[PDB]
């Protein structure tokens, strides 16, 4: 990645609506951790990289 893709993050999405989630660590061109969720309708959405909230969605996805 050549720059930060996420500017503004949201919250309030039910895990039932999330198909997948990408956790992107800090890189050479982006000094921020980014969380992109692909919704069941196909929309890509930036989520608050709040570790407890993302870890709840992550466990619910693997179970």
């Amino acid at each position, epitope marked *: 990645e*050549l*720059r*930060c*893709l*996420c*500017m*503004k*993050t*949201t919250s309030g999405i039910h895990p039932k609506n999330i198909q997948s989630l990408e956790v992107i660590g800090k890189g050479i*061109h*982006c*000094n*921020q951790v*980014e969380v*992109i969720a692909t919704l069941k309708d196909g*929309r*890509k*959405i*930036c989520l608050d990289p709040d570790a407890p909230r993302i870890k709840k969605i992550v466990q619910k996805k693997l179970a």
Partner: antibody, heavy 126, light 108 residues
Framework: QVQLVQSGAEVKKPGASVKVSCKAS????????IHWVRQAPGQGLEWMGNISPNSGSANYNEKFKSRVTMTRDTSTSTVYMELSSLRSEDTAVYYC???????????????????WGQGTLVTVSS | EIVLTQSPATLSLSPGERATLSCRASQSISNNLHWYQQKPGQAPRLLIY???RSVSGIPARFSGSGSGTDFTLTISSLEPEDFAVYYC?????????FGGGTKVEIKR
């Protein structure tokens, strides 16, 4: 009124540091990146870095990384740029500029910097 | 890091004439190329963003185009207020890069 209001002109001795502020008003602060661009006398534009009003995290040009700090204050809708170990070559007009509006949808298609501050002249002299 | 090359360095024309400004990118930057105007003593102003998209408050005479690494700004008919410096700027990747600028001066 949609504006970026920068702090006044500065005079600094070589080796000192300067902190320039940029106050946003009339728009959604959290929806635009804030860039810092400088222009040395009779020269072109040079990007120094940017800051996110949401995360408070900054991206720097490697050229300035060792002596620049960009910070934000959401309570006042103000961004700051601090430049240190000042030298004659740092005598320049420093501009802040917004890039957006961006939402919670990631993109690989970008807007330009549609709103610039008036600039802050920084003179490096003893 | 991207290098943006603007040509010519100086464009000398008369008011009412059409102006064509060029920007060449060292490598691809998708369509994330934007145009700015700067007048002496003033802050830069955005004219065109995303190669050809229109900007609120900007007059109709300004338009842009560009395929691959080649980009162009056109002023259909120069007004006295258009004799200024014009920069192209990319934000496809960081660090953001601007061209060296093109000064549009009155011909004599």
């Amino acid at each position: 009124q949609v504006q970026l209001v920068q702090s006044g002109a500065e005079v600094k001795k070589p080796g000192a540091s300067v902190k320039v502020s940029c106050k946003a008003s009339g728009y959604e602060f959290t929806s635009y990146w804030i860039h810092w661009v400088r222009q040395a006398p009779g020269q072109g534009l040079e990007w120094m870095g940017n800051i996110s009003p949401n995360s408070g995290s900054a991206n720097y040009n490697e050229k300035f990384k060792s002596r620049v700090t960009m910070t934000r204050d959401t309570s006042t809708s103000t961004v700051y740029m601090e430049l240190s170990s000042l030298r004659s070559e740092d005598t320049a007009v420093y501009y802040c500029a917004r890039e957006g509006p961006y939402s919670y949808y990631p993109s690989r298609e970008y807007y330009g910097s549609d709103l610039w501050g008036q600039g802050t002249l920084v003179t490096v002299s003893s | 890091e991207i290098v943006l090359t603007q040509s010519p360095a100086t464009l000398s024309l008369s008011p009412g004439e059409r102006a064509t400004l060029s920007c060449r990118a060292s490598q691809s930057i998708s369509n994330n190329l934007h145009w700015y105007q700067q007048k002496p003593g003033q802050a830069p102003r955005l004219l065109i963003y995303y190669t050809s998209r229109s900007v609120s408050g900007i007059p109709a005479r300004f338009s842009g185009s560009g395929s691959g690494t080649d980009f162009t700004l056109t002023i259909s008919s120069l007004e006295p207020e258009d004799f200024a410096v014009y920069y192209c700027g990319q934000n496809n990747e960081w660090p953001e890069v601007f061209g060296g600028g093109t000064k549009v001066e009155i011909k004599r």
